Design a protein around this ligand. Structure first.
Ligand SMILES: O=C(O)c1ccccc1Nc1ccc(OCCCCCP(=O)(O)O)cc1C(=O)O
Ligand SMILES: O=C(O)c1ccccc1Nc1ccc(OCCCCCP(=O)(O)O)cc1C(=O)O
Lengths: 331, 335
């Protein structure tokens, strides 16, 4: 195993042999990888087009180096709501208010919204565990939990272009949720992620908006990879089938203060395209959550998930869970 | 112009816009490119498959950053003999000595790893400044440009090469950035599509060059099989198939063609008159460079040019002129 061997293989457009991706990630996590080698690998793998086995090794090794949460502090039915690259933050809160444990994993952009809302996002494992137990939701700040990734994070900024590493966020949640709604901006890489979750024995909905969104929207149809029990089902999803009005991407589009205001409005009951998108993804995460204890029918599962997501807002539960989340950090 | 744009375009398998490659390389040549950005650029363009225009822009920038030789020290008809590397430093090194001994000025360009290593094993002083390389050309008829000495600004790229350790588009720059700027030569490449790219760059320069690709992976004309030759001259490129058998050369084996000291011994044997596959390959490539040299001042017929090139190359060995030139080369550095 060497960088010449692995990189040479990728630049010949060949899939890696077993363990090679894992070796590369280990060199990164130990700090032995040079920036040039990280970049070469990220770019070469991306242009080659990564496989689930390769992504599974990258995410697997990285996750094993992450700060774990304390033993028995994360429910077995905890879920994630996230995309690879607004709505996922809101959806996470709603799902939590519906009675589903949610544990997110994120970073500040070049998480910011949660800070603008007064949430203390940068907490250690013990307090994230307490947050999950007392508020019903927790947030793992990525730099806090993945410090060994910092050189790769720097590389990713310096090159600026999306690479295979942009798939690692949803696959390296330190709390190791077994369920969730996972959004991917590219159909090619969406199926790859579904394969990784499949091997993990996760129950997730890997979603890809046919408009290029990394989450279920009301702008157009979406492709969903239904992952459960090690199997993947590819489906098409039309929100219109659930009486949702179509919208434009302009409405689902700002700064932290603006995003924070959007959150309070939606949680405050404000109707519109933004709310609809939040309810869709929240429902998706709930349907994924149900996929742990059962394998119910697609339509009626979504009917139930949409009902719970909607009620979580309209009860004031979501708005009040947020308030409790802010009060938690203050005390 | 920025890295996210250029790298974005490349990873999308799109050719760059005019000027972008040059911008990228200059950022690299000025220490303004992060190692990650250098590696990302080199790898991305490699897998995209570089164009002659892109490589030409890279080579143009790198060459403009290089130290020149003094004015009026490099003859107009100086040649280079080199391969971009196999997947053959013994062959090219010997061919260069033979060509010089034939009366054709030769100026080489290489580094330690290796091209320069074999010469050091032979006792040649490789790391000389412009004025001494100039003296070597005039007094010995051959000169060597030590790549780190003449391309100091390439140090950031050179470090990245080592760290990734895989061939990239950058490996094409050597023959295209010879700081003596020979207008002719024999240039080898282990891959056909990259050979065609380099031929395109030499064409744009109006150079007289044979770009060669052994159909067995050799970055030089081989005896083991046929070769493709891009005959570059007068801004145009003829793509030709080449069979040494047509000149009476026996079909050798690749195994018949590793340390610098081992290569150094092979040089002394061949230049000493030892016959075999290696001699044949040396004479072929040397003859090729002489054909290229002829293309500077005339459009000669292909076969007669080669026959004359083979005649002179063989003579340069048989008379002992090649062996003696090496000796003078060594002595020159000792003094
Ligand atoms: O930059 C640092 O120097 C640093 C220092 C201490 C700890 C962490 C540090 N950097 C990071 C480490 C992990 C990370 O994120 C881990 C990858 C998962 C993030 C999810 P994303 O792909 O959506 O951003 C990001 C950074 C960073 O600089 O931003
Ligand atoms: O190797 C160095 O030590 C070096 C130091 C400072 C600046 C540049 C350095 N290396 C190079 C200089 C020019 C170059 O390109 C032109 C010469 C190409 C020589 C190819 P060869 O090794 O097969 O002869 C390549 C390198 C390099 O190490 O990659």
């Amino acid at each position: 195993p060497s960088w010449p061997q692995i990189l040479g293989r990728l630049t010949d457009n060949r899939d890696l042999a077993r363990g090679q991706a894992a070796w590369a990630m280990d060199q990164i996590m130990t700090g032995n990888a040079r920036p040039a080698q990280i970049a070469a690998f990220a770019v070469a793998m991306t242009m080659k087009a990564p496989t689930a086995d390769e992504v599974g090794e990258l995410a697997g090794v990285m996750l094993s180096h992450a700060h774990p949460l304390p033993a028995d502090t994360v429910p077995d039915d905890a879920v994630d709501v996230v995309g690879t690259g607004n709505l996922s933050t809101m959806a996470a809160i709603v799902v939590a208010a519906a009675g589903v444990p949610v544990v997110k994993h994120g970073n500040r952009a070049a998480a910011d919204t949660l800070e603008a809302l007064g949430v203390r996002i940068d907490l250690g494992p013990d307090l994230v565990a307490r947050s999950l137990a007392e508020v019903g939701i927790g947030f793992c700040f990525a730099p806090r939990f993945h410090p060994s990734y910092r050189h790769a994070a720097a590389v990713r900024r310096e090159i600026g272009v999306p690479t295979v590493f942009n798939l690692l966020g949803p696959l390296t949640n330190p709390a190791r949720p077994r369920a969730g709604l996972i959004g991917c901006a590219f159909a090619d890489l969406a199926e790859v992620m579904a394969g990784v979750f499949a091997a993990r024995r996760s129950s997730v909905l890997v979603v890809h908006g046919d408009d290029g969104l990394d989450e279920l929207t009301t702008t157009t149809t979406s492709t969903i990879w239904r992952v459960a029990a090690g199997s993947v089902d590819k489906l098409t999803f039309d929100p219109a089938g659930f009486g949702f009005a179509r919208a434009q991407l302009d409405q689902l589009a700002g700064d932290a203060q603006a995003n924070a205001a959007a959150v309070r409005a939606v949680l405050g009951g404000a109707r519109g395209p933004v709310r609809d998108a939040v309810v869709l993804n929240a429902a998706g995460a709930i349907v994924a959550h149900a996929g742990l204890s059962s394998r119910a029918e697609w339509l009626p599962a979504w009917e139930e998930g949409l009902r719970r997501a909607s009620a979580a807002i309209d009860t004031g539960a979501a708005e009040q869970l947020l308030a409790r989340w802010v009060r938690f950090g203050r005390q």
